Amino acid sequence: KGEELFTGVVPILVELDGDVNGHKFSVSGEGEGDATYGKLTLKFICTTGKLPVPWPTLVTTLVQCFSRYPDHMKRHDFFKSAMPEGYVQERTIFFKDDGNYKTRAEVKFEGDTLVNRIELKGIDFKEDGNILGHKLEYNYNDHQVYIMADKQKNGIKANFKIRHNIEDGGVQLADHYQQNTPIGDGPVLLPDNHYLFTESTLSKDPNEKRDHMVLLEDVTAAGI
């Protein structure tokens, strides 16, 4: 089983390359996940300098294999099942009245480390909108994710809505469309419909001079 790869703390590495309206950027994150408690702890740095989009818009793009699946649910855990070879995660994210992100990620084990490697492409944004103009509060409004099997692709799909609080009143919507595919050729646990719940808090490291985000997360799965 790939679920036996997660019985304890797993080091995480995240690498993102982005291009939003031609503004390029990269992000490196590092931390650890523990699926037995359903918790992640990560710190991301923008390694190109100044992040040209708000950190909260990248949270969903920046490892649902760390959700805590109850024992009576273990057999619906597609994400752990695909390990160590991993899964491709693709999303389109539509920002209401603004541009869209398209993301492609490989989430897999590189030896002992769980790696999430991402390519992000954003188009049709407004240079003075809430995203390219940095008008989003540095906080987070989580939403549950309704996971559905995607039998035609031997993986899962989902769609969900993220609400981003706008500095000075107003809420900015981000409509996520997601689908995941196994990278290897083993058998993969295809689930019944269920929910993943996440609670995120964003913070800053007072001793960090680079553009960065500290992110703590509790993640569980539940049924019906």
Side-chain angles (χ1 to χ4, degrees), residues 55-56 59 138-140 200-204 213-216:
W55 281 109
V59 169
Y138 188 77
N139 50 31
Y140 211 78
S200 315
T201 84
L202 315 198
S203 54
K204 302 286 185 190
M213 150 188 76
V214 172
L215 168 67
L216 272 45

Side-chain angles (χ1 to χ4, degrees), residues 192-207:
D192 282 344
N193 291 1
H194 60 284
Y195 293 97
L196 299 181
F197 310 119
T198 74
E199 206 192 323
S200 315
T201 84
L202 315 198
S203 54
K204 302 286 185 190
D205 170 4
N207 287 322

Side-chain angles (χ1 to χ4, degrees), residues 82-130:
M83 296 303 158
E85 302 90 348
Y87 55 78
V88 174
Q89 186 164 292
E90 295 173 287
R91 289 209 184 96
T92 305
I93 303 169
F94 295 100
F95 291 93
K96 214 184 137 137
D97 299 315
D98 212 320
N100 65 83
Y101 295 161
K102 275 198 140 282
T103 64
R104 188 171 178 296
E106 303 210 349
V107 182
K108 54 149 145 39
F109 271 95
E110 298 189 345
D112 287 337
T113 302
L114 193 283
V115 187
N116 179 18
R117 286 172 188 300
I118 312 141
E119 291 170 347
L120 184 150
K121 182 71 183 94
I123 54 161
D124 289 332
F125 282 90
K126 270 130 80 143
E127 289 286 343
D128 59 343
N130 297 327

Side-chain angles (χ1 to χ4, degrees), residues 167-193:
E167 284 179 12
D168 242 45
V171 167
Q172 165 73 62
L173 270 275
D175 199 1
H176 286 60
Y177 292 79
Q178 172 183 339
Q179 39 180 180
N180 297 42
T181 298
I183 285 201
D185 288 275
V188 279
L189 281 100
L190 296 178
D192 282 344
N193 291 1

